[PDB]
Specification:
In chain A, 40% of the residues lie in helices and 9% in strands. Chain A is mainly α and 99 residues long. A two-stranded antiparallel sheet of chain A has the order 1-2. The relative contact order of chain A is 0.16. Chain H has five helices and six strands, in the order βαββββααβαα. The chains are: A mainly alpha (99), C alpha+beta (186), D alpha+beta (97), G little secondary structure (107), H alpha+beta (177), J alpha/beta (209). At the G-K interface, strand 1 of G face helix 2, helix 3 and helix 5 of K. Bound molecules: magnesium ion and zinc ion (3 copies). It is classed as transcription.
């Protein structure tokens, strides 16, 4: 659950990838005689090559990091402040707590 | 085994196929040499050597 | 950073080492005794070992009671203070204090002569005290400062305080148990 | 059963299995471990890939796509438990040729 | 360790020479000797131990380590290295052991019992893993050997 | 196995039965074989039990 | 080796803030400007130099005299010695021979 | 609950006194210009303080002995104390910095530290005059150690024979069975 | 009979078979005289279940008052009076009591000897042990219970304290064992204390430095191990096997065996007593309830 | 010193050129038995030798089948090779119009260039080694059997003999030191001749993956 | 035979030294193929053995030495203007020791990971004495950071290649031909074989993983066979060569040395049900369900 | 290397531990958030001067050289007084005047419990900890690591020993249940 | 992959007397908690204890599969060991 949740974008719900990368990975899946150990290896490969992108190319909505926050409890870091310039998305969220 | 109170089990196969396989492959006469290096195991024992 | 280096192992000169080290540490500037740069030689820092407080200079030995007192009386004959320890109860009894068997202590004794101190051949000592004898042995060595003071509460508001001197040594008095057992068989 | 207080039955341990593999006798350990321990017969639906009863698959309500199989009981119990844990061991099966 | 090696060499020499002297006098028609010669039971070491002299009792390939401070038992002086104060037995099973030799002998013996008790796990587990790994290989009709796939 | 103690037990028991004595095999003690030999020989048996 | 302030009894530190360095406390204003030498240290620590010359490094250390074996005596092993741990502990020597298929090397 | 507080002067003119550090310390511990109740009169520390810790409750078995040629004079002690320098001025500086920044249950107050602090504070302070060892007053007071009297006197006490002494210092384990 | 009797002298272990460490299973020299070298179970529990020796005692908690009272008089200096520097001298020893620090002493030999003499006289309970550790310069005094003991004969200047006249008196009944204790003829020794002694084994091995003597070495072996004749002529494992198999031999259980109704009970029709018997067989009255026959 | 550096230079020249000969490129026999004194004759002493040039070699070509195919061997000097340096070699390479190149680093080479050394171009490939490895030719080592790369015809005949699909053969890792030595690429099969303890021989084949 | 194992004594090459693992634990070590083993051993040849030339200085250059006893004394050199660290060297003792260390080589040795001390901070005052100038770092450091920079004589981090300690006797008896060898207790085959003055083509390691990583898979399988045979014959027991050949071929037919463990068997195999049948059952089954993998029965 | 004692008495069974992880000495206890440099503990204990601490440890050159680096980290922090260390401990407390007095009572009645302290004179605990530190540091000179098997360190329980604890537990529970019932009945029923 | 229903295992793989098997106890406690949360949410009580009941159901459903989980907070940690599915699949 947390694995597949660490790849999906939380706004558009698609995968974080570029079109040519999608094409390359589909061709990688196409080869005959795909093996179970090959599947685990390419699982790790896809995780590494997808976790890098902070925005996906169909909508560009930013998605943060997904991390376990407790025993069978899972949290997401979209509305997270950063040491760099304050993200516009989190600024409104912070301002919205007036009441 | 050493006959100091030891015990051993025994099975009776219930088929002709099992009978034939046991007799031909597991027979004692066909297993006089150990397969580790081909040296005999069933030979004389103490008090037959004396 | 160099990488090609020719190693050397042929023997060299010792006095060369000494002279070079001299050149690197003997160019003293100790003459810089300015007003702000003055030190009191008494106010030097200290070695942790109180006996060896001589880390930087200007350029305990085994002892026994008989030898210690012999030194105290022959080589020198000035006054001296000693800090001695006594058994829990002295061989006396309370002087009509009305009595539990409360312990007989020096604090509850009258003035005057109380006993004799004996040195015998071979260098062992007893405090002949009434009809019993207490052995005397050296205590743990002392190196920190100790001062003997007398506090006079001259008035309920205020008093006065005068120093008498500093202690240097310790003595321990213990009953001679095997002697008591030998005298009174059990 | 296990003991001698109850009537027993001796065990074909995990090492006798390897001895019999070493001999290369393939029908004898089948006879020892299935025929004479828990040989059980079930019925399986090939349309959906999971087992039914009495030749009727309640999952499909069809009796025309069910076949009987001979299988050790412990394997059937394993399948029941697994399907209970939401691990579905769907089967595929064909003729014996 | 030089001293230890010298001591061990000399004690081994003592036992070996005692055994040889024993065997030379031993007559034929002796029963242990007959059993040892035909190999049906026993050997020359057992004969020499029963008759002439039991050897240095060694624990983990070394003399008996001290169990008290700087000695093995209170019956021996501190910082002793004499042959007897470290397990050497000068008495054969015929003439019988003294209490200290008996204790050192039992101390050395119990190691074998403990070892046999422990051995029941490691070798069995290793064989389990190995037979699980190697089970599928078979010899084919092409003279090759191939895996299950 | 080197259980010489059994051999000495057999000899001592044979020596004891013939004249009503009970022998002792106490640890680090007990009846010595040297006297038992003469006990055997006094009654007309071989002094080593054969 | 360590020093303590007599004024308050604490470990002092070295610092420079004037024409000459000084031994100074930090909880009390005691200062003792240093003007002479001291001749002892804490015995520093750097690790085992093993292969900095490994194999056949600079051949400047070619030497003439060598010992010989008590058994065989072919012409190839000149002598060597080395050191154990630190400044004030003994220095060990080993004598080692090598042609092939054995494990000889003496101490 | 015998305890003492001893105040010690410190030299400031000598060079080993870091004047800048002393001024910094005084500023850190004392008010900038208050000076009404100041730990130091000047803008640098003029004194350091010592505090005492008691060693043992009972001192009956300890005595102070004065040696003299041919004779020893003993005297019981009224107490033994251990003196250390005090670092309370750092605490005072910290407190000044902080102030610049800004059917009851069963009683268990007996075991609390501040209870003992309050109990000690109940006792009023006593101030003492001081005379150094250099003062002849010390030698004058030294005379009281030498008790007068005949050199040879048979003491009235100390009548117990050694058996009674052993009985006394090793009482029976059980008073009554 | 032996199966029942030997259980009363069996010791468990708290390790409880957790894992293999090649540690507490082995036999140590520290068990001399307290635990049976031979009677240990064969199999997976080897070494982890143990049996008591024949002449052994267990101590119990003590008063703890007179020990400190006496210690304060032997010249031990209070720790509060002096600073921590003194611990570093090469001539001062710490004094403990059940692990709790009690003071510092110079010239510990006088203290130890006086303490032992005071205990022998009768002013300190006989189960209090005092021992020295030169490596760390400490003196340990222990008074709590649960620690094993053995009696020994005291030796002074190469002559045992006991004498044939005492043995004659004991045979006649004029005295008993506790009389030997009170007259300083024998004393108990703990494991820690006997680390500092020189236990001569036989009289003819006594030398200058020996300080105690063994009453009877044959008491090293326990109850079940005292049935073997000539245990010292056998290879060691055989004694353990006999210890294990003596608890199963059929025989007689007791005089009331004909009235018990128990789940299972084995008897022998015509038991006979041994023809070669130990002295432990006489101690436990094994001959009255024998198990076996002569062949 | 100043001989041991040249000793290393002579040894690595010997080993690299043995590798070049085994790969089949053009080489002259007279240069094969080059002596260390011969190296001193053809190149001066260490103070007079400039590392980045004094061992460069590109004369080797694939004369066996295509003499026009040339190979580059470069010898950086800095302990860790940088991006600008590899750019310099690559631009000189583009000037000379060859397809493949070879590098020998003293100690290592930076992670940025580590990444760059895999995606410069599909048409170009570069070979990387260390001096320590090349100080001895592993093909002469005792443990290593004889590896022989074999053409497409031979592999076709092989997998026609035993009736395999090519993916059933045992695998040899693409990063294996011997694979690097022969520089073989994925999809190639190497015959191995294992020496029996007797005069006999065993033959096996492995596929690069 | 592993159960027949008796763990006999006096297996220390007849000298009671080099307590290398031997017996069932040795077989466990070989079979598991763990990347790190205990008591690794490397051997080498030079040209010849005994008395006069070229052999034992190689041992001197390779094996363990500290900065250590080369300094006969170490002591402070404080002086008013500033303070700094001095290193004395015993060059005659080094001459008898005849290692190529010298003031310049040790000066080069310094500044290797020693907190970026400049060559200006360290100077050669004489051929036998070397000095280092401390400097403030400002990272919780001051001039009194001298206590921290006490990092020169036995242990912080050192010049050269670490992890090569020492070795001692293992004699022979055959005098028909005379033959000796070098033993190295270390974990670096590449450096030892690549170094000058040693016959690299005959250096072998008993660590199979190092051999695989340095010389390829064929040398790895040959070493596996050799080690198995060596242990088996050393304990005094026999086994036909074909069995160990098959085991080594199984271990190294996938291009890597795959030990016989749960990880190695997982890598070697693909059948879900067998894997769950051996070890790590629940995770295997859950992952198999996740992937929707279909498994045959062969 | 490390040291530990299982301080246990009639009231409770507890434990402590010391570590030498990096080169300086730390005190470890399950009730505290994590380990602390030992010098902080010494200053909290009631001794301030570093000279006195070194005096307690020892004066031999090697022992103090090895104890050296255990006080520079304390020097780096601003802990020079007793209440500074008390504040630091109170900052590092774990729970299942809190800042000062809680730390004091914890350190007085839970650390090395068998060592007694009644009037908050902490010299005895200071000495005990100092000797323990000296033990662990000198243990590195020679590898004479204490062997747990030595039968001087074994104690045996018995029937009357075990049964006493069980009876005490049952009696206490009986009294507690009776207390609860008595409280529940009278005010309401 | 997120569950909202459970198949109750047949009777035959959980005999009459384990009286009844522990899986039956787990099932009954789960359904009891379900009824509790349903009726209590319909009643309209405080939210935090609703979410607490949801967490408790989470924990019990988790335990139904694995009885080994260790991170359980103290105040509801189980008091006695029990057999889940894996405990009867895994192990000797
Ligand atoms: Mg048997
Ligand atoms: Zn999107
Ligand atoms: Zn269906
Ligand atoms: Zn200070």
């Amino acid at each position: 659950v947390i694995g597949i949740l660490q790849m999906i974008c939380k706004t558009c719900c698609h995968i974080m990838l570029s079109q040519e990368e999608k094409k390359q990975f589909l061709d990688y899946l196409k080869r005959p005689g795909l093996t179970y150990l090959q599947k685990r290896g390419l699982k790790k490969k896809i995780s590494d090559k997808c976790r890098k992108k902070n925005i996906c190319h169909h909508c560009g909505a930013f998605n943060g990091t997904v991390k376990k926050c407790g025993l069978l409890k899972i949290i997401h870091e979209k509305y997270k402040t950063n040491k760099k310039v304050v993200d516009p998305i989190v600024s409104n969220f912070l301002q919205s707590f007036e009441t | 085994a050493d006959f100091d109170g030891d015990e051993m089990n025994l099975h009776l196969p219930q088929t002709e196929e099992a009978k034939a396989e046991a007799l031909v492959l597991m027979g004692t006469k066909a297993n006089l040499v150990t397969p580790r290096n081909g040296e005999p195991l069933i030979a004389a024992i103490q008090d037959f050597l004396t | 950073r160099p990488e090609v280096i020719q190693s050397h192992s042929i023997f060299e000169q010792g006095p060369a080492e000494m002279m070079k080290k001299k050149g690197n540490w003997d160019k003293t500037v100790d003459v810089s005794d300015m007003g702000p740069s003055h030190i009191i030689n008494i106010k030097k820092e200290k070695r942790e070992t109180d006996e060896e407080t001589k880390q930087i200079l200007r350029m305990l030995p085994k002892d026994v009671s008989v030898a210690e007192l012999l030194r105290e009386l022959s080589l020198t004959k000035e006054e001296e203070l000693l800090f001695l320890q006594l058994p829990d109860t002295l061989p006396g009894q309370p002087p009509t204090q009305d009595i539990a068997e409360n312990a007989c202590t020096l604090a509850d004794l009258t003035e005057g002569q109380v006993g004799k101190l004996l040195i015998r051949k071979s260098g062992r000592v007893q405090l002949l005290l009434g009809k019993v004898t207490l052995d005397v042995t050296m205590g743990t060595a002392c190196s920190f400062l100790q001062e003997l003071v007398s506090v006079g509460l001259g008035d309920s508001r205020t008093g006065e305080m005068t120093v008498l001197g500093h202690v240097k040594h310790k003595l321990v008095c213990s009953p001679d148990f095997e002697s008591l057992l030998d005298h009174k068989h059990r | 059963t296990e003991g001698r207080s109850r009537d027993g039955g001796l065990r074909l341990g995990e090492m006798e299995r390897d001895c019999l593999i070493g001999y290369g006798a393939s029908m004898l350990l089948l006879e020892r471990l299935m025929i004479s321990s828990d040989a059980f017969e079930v019925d399986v639906c090939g349309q959906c890939g999971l087992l039914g009863y009495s030749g009727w698959c309640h999952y499909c309500k069809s009796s025309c796509h069910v076949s009987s199989l001979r299988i050790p009981y412990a394997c059937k119990l394993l399948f029941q438990e697994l399907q209970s844990m939401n691990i579905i061991p769907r089967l595929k099966l064909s003729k014996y040729n | 360790e030089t001293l230890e090696a010298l001591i061990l060499k000399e004690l081994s020499v003592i036992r070996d020479h005692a055994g040889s002297a024993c065997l030379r006098e031993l007559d034929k028609s002796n029963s242990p000797l007959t059993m040892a010669l035909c190999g049906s039971k026993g050997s020359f070491i057992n004969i020499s131990q029963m008759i002439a002299c039991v050897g240095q009792q060694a624990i983990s390939g070394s003399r008996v380590p001290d169990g008290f401070e700087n000695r093995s038992l209170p019956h021996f002086e501190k910082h002793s290295k004499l042959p007897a104060a470290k397990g050497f037995v000068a008495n054969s099973f015929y003439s019988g052991l003294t209490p200290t030799e008996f204790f050192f002998h039992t101390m050395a013996g119990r190691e074998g019992l403990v070892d046999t008790a422990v051995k029941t796990a490691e070798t069995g587990y290793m064989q389990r893993r190995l037979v699980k790994s190697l089970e599928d290989l078979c010899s084919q009709y092409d003279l090759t050997v191939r895996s299950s796939t | 196995r080197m259980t010489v103690g059994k051999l000495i037990e057999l000899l001592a028991g044979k020596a004891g039965v013939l004249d009503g004595r009970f022998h002792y095999g106490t640890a680090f003690g007990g009846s010595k074989v040297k006297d038992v030999c003469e006990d055997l020989v006094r009654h007309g048996y071989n002094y080593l039990g054969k | 080796m360590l020093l303590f302030c007599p004024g308050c009894g604490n470990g002092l530190i070295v610092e420079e803030g004037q024409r000459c360095h000084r031994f100074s406390c930090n909880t009390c204003p005691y200062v003792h400007n240093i003007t002479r030498k001291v001749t002892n240290r804490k015995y520093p620590k750097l690790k085992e130099v093993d292969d900095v010359l490994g194999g056949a490094a600079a051949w400047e250390n070619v030497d003439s005299t060598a010992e010989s074996c008590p058994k065989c005596e072919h012409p190839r092993a000149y002598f060597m010695q080395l050191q154990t741990r630190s400044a004030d502990e003994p220095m060990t020597t080993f004598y080692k021979c090598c042609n092939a298929q054995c494990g000889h090397r003496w101490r | 609950q015998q305890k003492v507080e001893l105040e010690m002067a410190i030299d400031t003119l000598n060079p080993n006194y870091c004047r800048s550090k002393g001024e910094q310390i005084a500023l850190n511990v004392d008010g900038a210009c208050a000076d009404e109740t100041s730990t130091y009169s000047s803008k640098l520390m003029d004194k350091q303080t010592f505090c005492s810790s008691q060693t043992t409750s009972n001192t009956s078995r300890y005595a102070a002995a004065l040696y003299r040629q041919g004779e020893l004079h003993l005297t019981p002690l009224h107490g033994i104390l251990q003196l250390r320098p005090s670092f309370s001025y750092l605490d005072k500086a910290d407190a000044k910095h902080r102030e610049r920044e800004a059917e009851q249950a069963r009683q268990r107050r007996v075991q609390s530290y501040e209870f003992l602090q309050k109990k000690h504070a109940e006792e009023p302070w006593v101030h003492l005059h001081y005379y150094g060892l250099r003062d002849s007053r010390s030698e004058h007071e030294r005379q009281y150690l030498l008790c007068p009297g005949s050199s040879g006197v048979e003491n009235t006490e100390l009548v117990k024979s050694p058996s009674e002494y052993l009985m006394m210092l090793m009482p029976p384990s059980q008073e009554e069975e | 009979y032996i199966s029942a009797l030997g259980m009363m002298t069996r010791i468990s272990s708290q390790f409880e078979k957790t894992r293999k460490v090649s540690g507490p299973r082995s036999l140590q020299p520290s068990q001399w005289g307290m635990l049976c070298p031979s009677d240990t179970p064969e199999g997976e529990a080897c070494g982890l279940v143990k049996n008591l020796a024949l002449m052994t005692h267990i101590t119990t908690d003590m008063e703890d008052g007179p020990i400190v009272k006496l210690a304060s008089n032997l010249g031990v200096e209070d720790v509060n009076l002096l600073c921590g520097e003194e611990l570093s001298y090469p001539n001062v020893f710490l004094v403990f009591l059940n692990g709790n620090i009690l003071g510092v002493i110079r010239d510990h030999k006088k203290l130890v000897n006086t303490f032992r003499l005071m205990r022998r006289a009768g002013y300190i309970n006989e189960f209090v042990s005092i021992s020295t550790n030169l490596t760390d310069r400490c003196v340990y005094i222990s008074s709590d219970g649960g620690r094993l003991c053995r009696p020994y004969i005291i030796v002074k200047k190469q002559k045992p304290a006991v004498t044939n006249k005492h043995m004659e008196e004991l045979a006649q009944g004029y005295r008993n064992f506790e009389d030997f204790l009170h007259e300083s003829l024998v004393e108990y020794l703990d494991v820690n204390e006997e680390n500092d002694c020189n236990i001569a084994l036989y009289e003819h091995t006594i030398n200058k430095d020996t300080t105690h003597l063994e009453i009877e070495p044959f008491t090293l072996l326990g109850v079940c191990a005292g049935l073997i004749p000539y245990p010292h002529h056998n290879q060691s494992p055989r004694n353990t096997y006999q210890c294990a198999m003596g608890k199963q031999a059929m025989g007689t259980i007791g005089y009331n065996q004909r009235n018990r109704i128990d789940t299972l009970m084995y008897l022998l029709a015509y038991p006979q007593k041994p023809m070669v018997k130990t002295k432990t067989i006489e101690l436990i009255e094994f001959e009255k309830l024998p198990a076996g026959q002569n062949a | 010193d100043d001989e041991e550096e040249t000793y290393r230079l002579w040894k690595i020249r010997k080993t690299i050129m043995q590798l070049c000969h085994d790969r089949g490129y053009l080489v002259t026999q007279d240069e094969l038995d080059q002596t260390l004194e011969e190296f001193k004759a053809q190149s001066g002493d260490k103070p007079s030798e400039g590392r980045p040039r004094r061992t460069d070699l590109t004369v080797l070509v694939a004369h066996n089948d295509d003499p026009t195919d040339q190979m580059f061997v470069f010898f950086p000097e800095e302990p860790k090779v940088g991006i600008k340096t590899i750019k310099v070699y690559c631009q000189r390479m583009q000037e000379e119009n060859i397809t493949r190149a070879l590098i020998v680093v003293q100690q290592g080479m930076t992670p940025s260039a580590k990444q760059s050394l895999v995606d410069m171009a599909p048409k170009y490939i570069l070979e990387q080694f260390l001096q320590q490895e090349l100080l001895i030719n592993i093909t002469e080592h005792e443990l290593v059997p004889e590896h022989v790369v074999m053409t497409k015809e031979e592999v076709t005949e092989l997998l026609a003999r035993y009736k395999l699909r090519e993916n059933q053969l045992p695998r040899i890792q693409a990063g294996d030191p011997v694979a690097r030595y022969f520089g073989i690429k994925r999809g190639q099969v190497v015959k191995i001749i294992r020496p029996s303890e007797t005069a006999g021989r065993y033959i096996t084949y492995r596929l690069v993956q | 035979p592993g159960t027949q194992m008796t763990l006999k004594t006096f297996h220390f090459a007849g000298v009671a030294s080099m307590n290398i693992t031997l017996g069932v634990p040795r077989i466990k070590e070989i079979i598991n193929a763990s990347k790190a083993i205990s008591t690794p051993i490397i051997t080498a040849q030079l040209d010849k053995d005994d008395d006069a030339d070229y052999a034992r200085l190689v041992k001197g250059r390779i094996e363990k030495t500290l900065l250590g006893e080369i300094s006969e004394y170490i002591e402070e050199v404080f002086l008013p203007d500033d303070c700094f660290i001095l290193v004395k060297l015993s060059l005659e003792r080094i001459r008898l020791l005849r290692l190529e260390v010298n003031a310049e080589t040790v000066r080069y040795s310094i500044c290797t990971s020693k907190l970026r001390v400049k060559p200006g901070d360290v100077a050669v005052h004489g051929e036998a004495v070397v000095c280092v100038t401390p400097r403030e770092n400002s990272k919780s450091s001051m001039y009194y950071v001298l206590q921290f920079l006490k990092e020169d004589l036995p242990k912080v981090v050192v010049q050269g290649i670490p992890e090569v300690s020492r070795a001692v006797i293992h004699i022979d008896e055959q005098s028909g031909k005379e033959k000796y060898k070098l033993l190295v207790e270390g974990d670096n085959l590449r450096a030892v074989m690549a170094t000058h003055g040693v016959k690299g083509t005959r250096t072998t390691s008993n660590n199979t993983y190092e051999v695989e990583k340095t010389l390829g898979i064929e040398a790895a399988r040959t070493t596996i066979i050799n080690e198995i045979q060596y242990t088996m014959v050393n304990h005094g027991m026999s086994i036909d060569r074909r069995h160990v050949m098959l085991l080594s071929d199984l271990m190294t037919y996938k291009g890597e040395v795959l030990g016989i463990t749960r990880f190695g068997l997982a890598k070697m195999k693909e059948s879900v049900l067998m894997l769950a049948s051996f070890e790590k059952t629940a995770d295997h089954l859950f992952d198999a369900a996740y992937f929707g993998q279909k498994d045959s029965v062969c | 290397v490390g040291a530990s004692v299982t301080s246990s008495t009639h009231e409770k069974k507890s434990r402590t531990n010391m570590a030498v992880k990096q080169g300086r000495f730390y005190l470890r206890h399950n009730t505290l958030s994590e380990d602390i440099p030992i010098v902080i503990i010494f200053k909290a204990m009631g001794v301030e001067s570093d000279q006195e601490i070194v005096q307690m440890i020892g004066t031999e050159e090697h022992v103090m050289a090895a104890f050296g680096p255990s006080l520079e980290e304390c020097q780096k922090a601003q802990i020079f007084t007793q209440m500074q260390a008390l504040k630091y401990i109170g900052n590092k407390v774990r729970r299942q005047k809190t800042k000062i007095e809680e730390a004091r009572e914890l350190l007085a009645s839970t650390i090395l419990t068998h060592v007694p302290v009644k009037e908050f004179n902490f010299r005895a605990k200071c000495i005990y900890t100092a000797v323990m530190v000296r033990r662990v540091i000198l243990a590195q000179g020679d590898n004479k690591v204490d062997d747990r098997d030595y039968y001087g360190n074994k104690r045996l329980e018995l029937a009357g020993q075990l049964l006493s604890l069980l009876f005490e537990d049952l009696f206490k529970k009986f009294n507690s249940e009776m207390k609860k019932i008595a409280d529940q009945v009278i005010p309401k029923q | 992959l997120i569950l909202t229903r459970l198949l109750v295992p047949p009777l035959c793989i959980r005999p009459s007397v384990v009286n009844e098997d522990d899986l039956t106890m787990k099932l009954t406690e789960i359904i009891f908690l379900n009824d509790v949360i349903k009726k209590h949410r319909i009643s309209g009580a405080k939210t935090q204890m609703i979410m607490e009941d949801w967490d408790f159901l989470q924990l019990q459903c988790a335990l139904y599969i694995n009885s080994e989980l260790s991170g359980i907070p103290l105040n509801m940690a189980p008091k006695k060991w029990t057999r889940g599915f894996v405990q009867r699949l895994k192990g000797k």
